Amino acid sequence: NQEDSMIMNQSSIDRGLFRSLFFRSYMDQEKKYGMSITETFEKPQRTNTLRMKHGTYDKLDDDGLIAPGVRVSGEDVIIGKTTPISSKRDASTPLRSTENGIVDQVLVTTNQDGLKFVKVRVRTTKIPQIGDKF
């Protein structure tokens, strides 16, 4: 506990002292490039020349979205999306590399324009550790 550092009661940390929740919300939109040409929320696959992400696509449902219960990690794809060119091209959203948690709430709406709008929140509990500030 020298030079502005402190000792913390491990026993107390377990019993729930200074333990916190953490949430992050990721968002996406089906953009309408020109007329009729629209982006699609779907779980993509290896078809012709689509620049797909390295992360696990297997956590996505057919709607290109993770189910709220699921536990995510690393660069796991949490939102699946495709963009057409003139077959498809990847435009999927992977969970922040430097992070991991459990999918919390998934919101499916429409933006003012009338296009599909999505917000994915991921919950993580952060327990006090050795480098943590107080």
């Binding site: 020298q2 030079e3 502005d4 550092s5 963009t83 060119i85 550790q129 050795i130 480098g131 500030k133």
Partner: protein, 1421 residues
């Protein structure tokens, strides 16, 4: 990079800057850039035959390049070109082009001034390529005739034709990016066409332009004008091409298409139906886009903004510093094999270790080559994989191709081969650079031993907290992993923590015992503190080295108990000998004061900050110098391990109880504050009753306020000192203050007794409201309570008023801190950028990248600052009688010889005439030394940092040989006398078989020898130290060895050292100069003032010393004060009046009726000017009416009729009439000359003169130095030239803070001396110490080029140093433009150039070359 090439690999030895010839631009080009388009023609989205285009380099990952067929990574890119429809000025040379035009005839191309002109002949002689062009321009600019003929050198009557036409020259002005001329009813005005300018330039002779700043081969003036524009390839302007149906062209690609578009517009316009006043329109546009492409942030012109309105990145702006290519991409770089996390301290790591979190260790790798030694280990790490801790990530084959152990299908069956590299995880004891930013020190980056640990923080030893300036308040640090067997060696052998222990910044250690360990060490080492066996055994085991020997307890019979002192001495190594006396420490140390460690055992004294801290005579400072940096680093750990363990079990705390002071002590404080408040009121009423007399050179208000704040401070101090005394030894705050671990008096004072007076801008809280500090007070309330005196302690709590006034002063702190952090930042950088290239050479000299001498030998002595210690020069002080008793030996005097009790020879040595000749000469030299030392250190200061700790050598010798201070020595007079003489010859700093280098050597060792002769005199050696021949011979061999070790190492980057050693202490300055002798501007603001070589300085002042035989006489001092302090007629005048008194013989004014009658016993103006003078003003300035009168009389001579009243008359009056239409208006002009202009007495600028009784250490008749206080005059203005010649002063002693002035009057040499003094006084005022050499080097640098070179943009950065080097600080693009225009050649010896070129710099490890000798190789095998 990457593929193999047969081409020979060399290093850039020189950079030849120059300008592109259009011809080159075409030759060098791979494509004629024709269209603004980038691709998609014929449909195909793939680069067009116009812009970008394959001919230039690849857009795609194609493998194609057309030119080299190499592919993106390997291909550098190739330049294309645009042929411009009309010539255009290169934006960066418009001013130079104008100056060339101003120098040459705008018609025949001849240089306007010939070698026929004498001033021109002198200007032509100038060897500096730039200074010549400056002198040439200033001479030719004001030549508006191209002469046909000129007067001949022989005779000016018979003129000679020099050649050239007879055309009038234009007055050129800059209007945007155009040049307009004005020739000679009314002048002719027209723009000068770019073509016309160019044509005239093309006609300038080689001899003419090489006489200007230019170069025939590399920069012909005509190349400043652009006709053929180079097109940078795609890698300069990368198309960030995302997806297939999208691209993302660079700003430069757009600006180039703009240039292209504007050009075609112009070319089609001029070729076709040219309206000629629409052609000039499109040409202006092409000039704009070519200008705005290179520099967009042009002076007083609109920005060439993007679609967005976004200004457009100019190539200039790309290179412009802090984030430019130079400052951000070349002097700095983001780098691979680097890590960063939160730091947190650990008592169980060794000083030189660094705790690396497993995750970090698992990411960072070292490329180890498979060799028979590691082949076996390495295959295990590869087996382990990239996921297990001691494992590896990649295997690099002979082929150069990388194997990814994470995915390789052969990751399990890899069979290594000698030569392959295994990129393994960083493992325990790998050397790594550890760094806490800002990096202001050598020590802000040190090398540590890896310790792979769990948890996500970097762990560091607490004693290494201080050099890094790290806290665990959430601080993060950087780790950099070396990759070469060679760069590791660099880290381990040059910058590892143990080496870095004794810093050359202050010739003292930069690490010591801190916090818990400091607090607990005092506690452990008390007389009162004893340890029972159980714990003694644990405290021993905890010392990892401990010899396994249980020490015999200090107490045996009642109970076996050990003392704190005792078992701590187990960590102190043998042969460690320390002695220190505090307050009143005797050898029977009554208070447990001082320190006495013998053979590494504590005899007496408490161990606290002065002993175990980072002190000048430290237990650390000694253990390093005596036992090794390694041995010392171990000691850090050992001391910690014991003390920390003992404190873990003793415990330590602090509470509100520790702020609580005694009831009666509180009564005493409340009273102290009360009586001070009354002392203030008594003065407040005294000033309100107009009885208070103002201080010399101070307003009544200034005087009153001074007394008030002096009382209210005296008060806070006394109140605090009451609590301080009353706090028991058990007071936890007092305990921390005592060890020196945390806190000081003021902390105790403010918390327990009284916070004190609050101050903003040097003064008590001012009336922000009309005549009140707050609305809660009445008007004109000068009380302690109103102007912000905080009566209360922190314990008692502040009142609402107190709270706000505290907050007002508090905020001033936070701002001043914020401002200083900024100001000191730049000061550090300018210091570094000004000294970079300064290094010690293999000839002991100190030189820059030009090889110009700065110091003839590093810091005048040629010693490495780390190997120096404060030592006493004994022969300097004391009585001559006491010196005599100490050093004189007279074998011819029965009671002044050496007693036979001292040496064997004693009996037979008496009367030995031949020997007395040796001791006589020995003594005559000791006398010589004494008088010399007294010439060097005038104040008689004896304690000076020198290189060999002679005290310690003799100490160790006595211990080593068990010197018996009883039996007589076996030394002979010749043994001592000649042994010392012989040693002196072997103390080599400079080797060189010539009188210059040899006399240099004699000088360099002049002071050290003085100390040597002082400490090894015959009487001392025999009577004091009781040395045997053996012991003596050893002392000599050791002094020699230690001395040689102490000299500076060629390669020492002594420049950066000095810069940082001044800079980092500046960042630690509180400032400015308290909240109030003279109040001179100090710290950061005065340091800024100095380095800038500011002419208008804040506090200019003189320190005039009185004539030798006049020092004591105050009346003599008063006389000079009177003689030098400036006095005006304005200062003595109450009012000025103009009357109409028509008869000079009578007077309308009846007061003057008496004054006329007299000054008209033993034609003039009827208008009278009457001045009333103030008796009081005349009295403070000790003036007479006649004194004033005569002064007016001599100012107007026979033009003004002056009469005046006598010093007795009720009213002091001066009557003035003019001598010999429109006369009244004249008197008002005279009254202004009278008040404003006229000077009564004193020297101009010398505005306020204070008398000071300064103390002075001076030798007494008896010999001893004695306090002889003298009267001294302190100025409030500077006029050195004039106050020097004033009688009654000592002009040999006069000083001024304005060194600019000292430089001007006494020479550059004295200027240097004063400059050092002033730099030193900034550092010394903040308490802090910086070793002479550092401050000397800065001062020497600012002075070598005869005169005061500032540490600024136009100071050092305007030197003849490397163009690349200089661009790396402040004027970057401008510098590089001039480099091309004047065809500069960078030598490439500056650190900076090699840093830019990515080459091994000629610095330290780079100062020499390594070669293999086949001869010796074959001899070893």
């Amino acid at each position: 990079g990457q593929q193999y090439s047969s081409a020979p690999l060399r290093t850039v030895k020189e950079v030849q800057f120059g300008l592109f010839s259009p011809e080159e631009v075409r030759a060098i080009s791979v494509a004629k850039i024709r269209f603004p388009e980038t691709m998609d023609e014929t449909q195909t989205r793939a680069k067009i035959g116009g812009l970008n285009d394959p001919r230039l380099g690849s857009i795609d990952r194609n493998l194609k390049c057309q030119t080299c067929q190499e592919g993106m990574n390997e291909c550098p890119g190739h330049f294309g070109h645009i042929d411009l429809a009309k010539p255009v000025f290169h934006v960066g040379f418009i001013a130079k082009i104008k100056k060339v035009c101003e120098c040459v005839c705008m018609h025949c191309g001849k240089l306007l001034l010939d070698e026929h002109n004498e001033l021109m002949r002198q200007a032509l002689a100038i060897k500096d390529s730039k200074k010549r062009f400056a002198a040439i321009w200033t001479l030719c600019k004001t030549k508006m005739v191209c002469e046909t003929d000129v007067p001949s050198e022989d005779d000016p009557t018979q003129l000679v034709s020099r050649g050239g036409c007879g055309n009038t020259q234009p007055t050129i002005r800059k209007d945007g990016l155009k040049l307009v001329g004005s020739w000679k009813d009314e002048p002719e005005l027209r723009v000068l066409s770019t073509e016309e300018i160019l044509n005239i330039f093309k006609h300038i002779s080689v001899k003419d332009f090489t006489s200007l700043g230019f170069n025939e081969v590399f920069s012909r003036p005509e190349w400043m004008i652009l006709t053929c524009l180079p097109v940078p390839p795609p890698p300069v302007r990368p198309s960030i091409s995302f997806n297939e149906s999208q691209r993302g062209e660079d700003d430069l690609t757009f600006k180039l298409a703009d240039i292209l578009k504007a050009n075609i517009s112009l070319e089609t316009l001029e070729h076709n139906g040219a309206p000629h006043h629409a052609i000039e329109e499109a040409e202006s546009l092409l000039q704009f886009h070519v200008a705005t492409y290179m520099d967009n942030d042009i002076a007083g012109q609109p920005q060439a903004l993007q679609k967005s309105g976004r200004p457009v990145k100019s190539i200039r702006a790309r290179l412009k510093g802090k984030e430019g290519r130079i400052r951000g991409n070349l002097m700095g770089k983001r780098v691979d094999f680097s890590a960063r996390t939160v730091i947190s301290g650990d008592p169980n790591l060794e000083l030189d270790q660094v705790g690396v979190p497993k995750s970090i260790a698992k990411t960072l790798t070292y490329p180890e080559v498979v060799t028979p030694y590691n082949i076996d280990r390495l295959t295990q790490l590869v087996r382990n994989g990239p996921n297990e801790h001691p494992g590896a990530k990649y295997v690099i084959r002979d082929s150069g191709d990388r194997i990814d152990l994470r995915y390789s299908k052969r990751a399990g069956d890899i069979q290594l081969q000698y030569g392959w590299k295994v990129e393994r995880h960083i493992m325990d004891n790998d050397p790594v650079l550890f760094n806490r930013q800002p990096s202001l020190h050598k020590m802000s980056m040190m090398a540590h031993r890896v310790k792979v640990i769990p948890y996500s923080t970097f762990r560091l030893n607490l004693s290494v907290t201080s050099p890094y300036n790290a806290d665990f308040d959430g601080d993060e640090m950087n780790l950099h992993v070396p990759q070469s067997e060679e760069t590791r060696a660099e880290l381990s052998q040059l910058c590892a923590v143990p080496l870095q222990i004794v810093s050359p910044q202050s010739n003292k250690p930069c690490m010591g015992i801190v916090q818990d360990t400091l607090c607990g060490i005092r506690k452990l080492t008390l007389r009162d503190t004893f340890i029972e066996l159980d714990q003694v055994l644990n405290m021993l085991y905890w010392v990892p080295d401990w010899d396994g020997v249980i020490p015999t307890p200090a107490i045996i019979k009642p109970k076996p108990l050990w003392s704190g002192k005792q078992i701590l001495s187990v960590a102190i190594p043998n042969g460690i000998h320390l002695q220190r006396f505090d307050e009143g420490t005797t050898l029977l140390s009554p208070k447990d004061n001082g320190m006495l460690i013998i053979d590494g055992q504590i005899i007496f004294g408490v161990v606290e900050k002065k002993t175990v801290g980072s002190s000048n005579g430290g237990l650390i400072h000694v253990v390093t110098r005596e036992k090794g940096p390694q041995v010392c680093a171990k000691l850090f750990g050992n001391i910690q391990k014991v003390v920390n363990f003992w404190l873990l079990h003793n415990g330590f705390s602090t509470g509100i109880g520790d702020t609580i002071a005694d009831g009666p002590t509180m009564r005493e404080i409340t009273e102290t504050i009360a009586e001070a408040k009354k002392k203030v009121l008594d003065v407040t009423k005294e000033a309100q009753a107009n009885l208070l007399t103002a201080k010399h050179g101070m307003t009544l208000r200034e005087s009153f306020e001074d007394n008030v704040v002096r009382f209210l401070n005296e008060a806070r101090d006394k109140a605090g000192r009451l609590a301080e005394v009353n706090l028991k030894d058990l007071n936890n705050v007092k305990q921390m203050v005592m060890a020196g671990s945390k806190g000081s008096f003021i902390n105790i004072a403010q918390m327990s007794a009284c916070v004190g007076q609050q101050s903003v801008e040097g003064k008590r809280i001012a009336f922000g409201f009309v005549d009140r500090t707050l609305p809660h007070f009445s008007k004109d309330d000068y009380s302690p309570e109103s102007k912000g005196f905080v009566e209360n302690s922190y314990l008692r709590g502040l009142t609402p008023q107190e709270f706000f006034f505290h907050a007002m002063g508090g905020r001033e702190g936070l701002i001043d801190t914020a401002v200083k952090t900024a100001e000191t930042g730049y000061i550090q950088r300018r210091l570094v950028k000004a000294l970079e290239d300064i290094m010690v050479h293999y000839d002991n000299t100190t030189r820059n990248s030009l090889g110009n001498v700065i110091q003839f030998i590093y810091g005048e002595d040629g010693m490495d600052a780390a190997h120096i210690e404060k030592q006493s020069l004994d022969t300097i002080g004391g009585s001559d009688a006491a010196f005599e008793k100490r050093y004189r030996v007279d074998l011819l005097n029965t009671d002044h010889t050496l007693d036979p009790s001292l040496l064997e020879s004693g009996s037979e040595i008496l009367g030995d005439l031949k020997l007395q000749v040796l001791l006589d000469e020995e003594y005559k030299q000791l006398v010589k030394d004494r008088k010399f030392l007294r010439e060097v250190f005038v104040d008689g200061e004896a304690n000076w940092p020198l290189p060999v700790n002679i005290r310690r050598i003799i100490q160790n010798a006595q211990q080593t040989f068990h010197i018996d201070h009883t039996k007589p020595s076996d030394l002979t007079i010749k043994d001592i006398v000649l042994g010392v003489k012989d040693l002196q010859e072997n103390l080599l700093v400079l080797r060189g078989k010539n009188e210059i280098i040899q006399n240099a050597q004699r000088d360099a060792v002049t002071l050290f020898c003085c100390l040597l002769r002082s400490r090894l005199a015959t009487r001392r050696v025999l009577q004091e130290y009781r040395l045997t021949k053996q012991a003596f011979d050893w002392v000599l061999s050791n002094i020699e060895a230690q001395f040689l070790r102490s000299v500076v190492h060629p390669g020492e980057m002594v420049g950066v050292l000095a810069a940082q050693s001044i800079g980092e202490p500046a960042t630690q300055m509180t400032l400015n100069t308290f909240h109030f002798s003279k109040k001179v501007t100090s710290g950061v603001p005065r340091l800024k003032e100095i380095l800038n070589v500011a002419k208008n300085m804040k506090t200019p002042s003189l320190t005039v010393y009185l004539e030798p035989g006049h020092a004591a006489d105050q009346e003599q001092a008063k006389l000079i004060r009177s003689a030098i302090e400036h006095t005006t007629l304005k200062s003595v005048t109450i009012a000025s009046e103009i009357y109409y008194d028509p008869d000079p013989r009578s007077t309308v004014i009846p007061e003057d009726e008496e004054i006329i009658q007299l000054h008209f016993s033993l034609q003039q103006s009827p208008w009278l000017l009457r001045l009333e003078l103030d008796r009081a003003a005349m009295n403070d300035k000790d003036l007479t009416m006649g004194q004033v009168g005569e002064r007016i009389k001599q100012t107007f001579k026979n033009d003004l009729f002056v009469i005046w009243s006598e010093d007795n008359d009720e009213k002091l009056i001066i009557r003035c009439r003019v001598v010999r239409a429109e006369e009244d208006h004249m008197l008002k002009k005279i009254e202004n000359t009278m008040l404003e202009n006229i000077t009564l007495r004193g020297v101009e600028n010398i505005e306020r003169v204070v008398m000071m009784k300064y103390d002075r250490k001076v030798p007494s008749p008896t010999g001893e130095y004695v306090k002889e206080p003298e009267w001294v005059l302190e100025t409030d203005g500077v006029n050195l030239s004039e106050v020097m010649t004033v009688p009654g002063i000592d002009p040999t002693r006069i000083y001024t803070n304005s060194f600019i002035d000292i430089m001007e009057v006494l020479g550059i040499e004295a200027g240097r001396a004063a400059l050092y003094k002033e730099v030193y006084n900034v550092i010394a005022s903040d308490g802090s110490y910086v070793n002479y050499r550092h401050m000397a080097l800065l001062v020497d640098v600012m002075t070598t080029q005869g005169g005061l070179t500032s540490v600024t943009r136009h100071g050092f950065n305007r030197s003849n140093t490397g163009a690349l080097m200089r661009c790396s600080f402040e004027e970057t693009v401008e510098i590089l433009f001039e480099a091309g225009a004047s065809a500069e050649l960078d030598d490439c010896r500056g650190v900076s150039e090699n840093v830019i070129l990515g080459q091994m710099a000629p610095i330290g490890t780079g100062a020499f070359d390594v070669m293999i000798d086949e001869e010796s190789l074959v001899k070893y095998m």
